[PDB]
Ligand binder design. Structure first.
Ligand code: XG4
Ligand code: MN
Ligand code: MN
Length: 430
DNA sequence: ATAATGACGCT
DNA sequence: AGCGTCAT
């Protein structure tokens, strides 16, 4: 009734770059602009695995996870860009540095939560209240929202894609309660005006294009972000959630794409997000635990309370390489060498981190995977990070895993390692 | 035999 | 402390 919290207290946006690693290479090499192209790591095996696909190549069916030699079967004119290699491994420095350019522009508008290398969450609540008071009381022109989609509109009593957008935008704006600085739909509209400005600044200042989702919480803005990619932004209001969730497959919601989402489907016998509304919170707490139960119950009414954390820098700095198949490390010296290669790149990035952000990692986590195991990591161990010295980090990382060699021979290493991963963490103000 | 990372929950 | 999940 009057005491049902509708999850409309905040304005939150999710900006995510369109085919990010591809845009970075396309800005650098103009010959790849507006062409089907992909980014690839390691051209030896089947031409390398594809990690990012432009939208022109997606049109032919090229996806990430594909081998470049298979993607050229689907698209013969596919242009490839290969990631820098340093010390025998992929090096993502170019994209990290591109990512920092974008984070700094978004930071100028609001406090952001770096959520990946190519996306950040924005909490625009206060900026919305600020803009609402300098607007005095003026209506909101559709000229302020040249790339916004209003999810669920048009509705009621034009055949092309941009025609629909306008007529949906017009309908929304025609309906807008301009008088009421408290109406949550007006605030989203104003959030969306700010996000247009911020997306323009990103494109003006980096040449990168991105999509954005604007809703009342992180989960809805993330889902909204995907609805009109690329180069568009989508407003999802509280009232569009019922129709939106009635055919929304469960797995498309953040944190439900895995086994939890699969057990919601199998146990509860449903397919779509909107179907969860029939269960009581207690029922959902019984099947999925108190925390998930409560979260599911509020979520399927479009209510979510996870806050935008004020974090623009990563909490961990990490460095890993896989060794699949016959290339799995099988001798002690081979393990030592790569641990040193990984420690060396970690050292350049730590030293850069300490001068740019004046903090220092204090703990070093070593994780490995053995051949024949099944999980991502097979063993995690940890020691102290006192000096930014690769040889010490290499030595210490080896020390705390060497007892895992079931090899009777000192020279050999079994079982063969298929993943080495080093991660500096527990950062303190420096 | 896509890889390379990063955040966070559970016990 | 060390493992498990979910993610881009
Ligand atoms: N190495 C590696 N990189 C990945 C992986 N997944 C993503 N990346 C890297 C490369 C990706 O470019 C970058 C951004 O990831 P997204 O936002 O999920 N997809 P993008 O921005 O490319 O397309 P869209 O327009 O659909 O958002 O993360 C992966 O599994 N492995
Ligand atoms: Mn992206
Ligand atoms: Mn992303």
């Amino acid at each position: 009734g009057p005491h049902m919290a509708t999850g409309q207290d905040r304005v939150v946006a999710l900006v995510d770059m369109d085919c990010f690693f591809v845009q970075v290479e396309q800005r650098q090499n103009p010959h790849l602009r507006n062409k089907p192209c992909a980014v690839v790591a390691y051209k030896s095996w089947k031409g390398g695995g594809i990690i990012a696909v432009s939208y022109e190549a997606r049109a032919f069916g090229v996806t990430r996870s594909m081998w470049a030699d298979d993607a050229k079967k689907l698209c013969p004119d596919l242009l490839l860009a290969q990631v820098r290699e340093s010390r025998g491994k992929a090096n993502l420095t170019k994209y990290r540095e591109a990512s920092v350019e974008v984070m700094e522009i978004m930071s100028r508008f609001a406090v952001i939560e770096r959520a990946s290398i190519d996306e950040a969450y924005v909490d625009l609540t206060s900026a919305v209240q600020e803009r609402l008071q300098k607007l005095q009381g003026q209506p909101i022109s559709a000229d302020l929202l040249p790339s916004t989609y209003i999810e669920g509109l048009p509705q009621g009593p034009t055949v092309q894609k941009e025609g629909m957008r306008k007529q949906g935008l017009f309908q929304w704006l025609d309906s807008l309660q301009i008088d009421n600085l408290t109406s949550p739909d007006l605030q989203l509209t104003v959030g969306a005006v700010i996000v247009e400005e911020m997306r323009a600044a990103i494109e003006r200042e980096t040449g990168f294009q991105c999509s954005a989702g604007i809703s009342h919480n992180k989960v809805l803005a993330k889902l909204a972000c995907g609805l009109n990619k690329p180069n568009r932004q989508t407003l999802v209001s509280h009232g569009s959630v019922p129709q939106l969730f009635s055919q929304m497959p469960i797995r498309k919601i953040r944190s439900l794409g895995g086994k939890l989402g699969a057990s919601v489907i199998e146990i509860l016998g449903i397919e779509y997000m909107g179907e969860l509304t029939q269960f009581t919170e207690s029922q959902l707490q019984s099947h999925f635990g108190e925390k998930n139960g409560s979260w599911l119950y509020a979520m399927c009414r479009g209510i979510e309370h996870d806050p935008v954390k004020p974090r623009q820098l990563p909490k961990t700095i990490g460095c890993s390489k896989n060794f699949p198949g016959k290339t799995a490390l099988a001798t002690r010296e081979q393990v030592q060498w790569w641990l040193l290669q990984l420690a060396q790149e970690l050292e350049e990035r730590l030293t850069k981190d300490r001068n740019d952000n004046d903090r220092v990692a204090t703990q070093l986590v070593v994780s490995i995977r053995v051949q024949g195991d099944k999980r991502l990591s097979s063993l995690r161990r940890c020691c102290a990070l006192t000096r930014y010295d690769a040889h010490k980090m290499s030595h210490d990382a080896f020390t705390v895993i060497k007892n895992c060699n079931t090899s009777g021979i000192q020279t050999e290493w079994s079982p063969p390692l298929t993943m080495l991963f080093l991660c500096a963490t527990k950062f303190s103000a420096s």
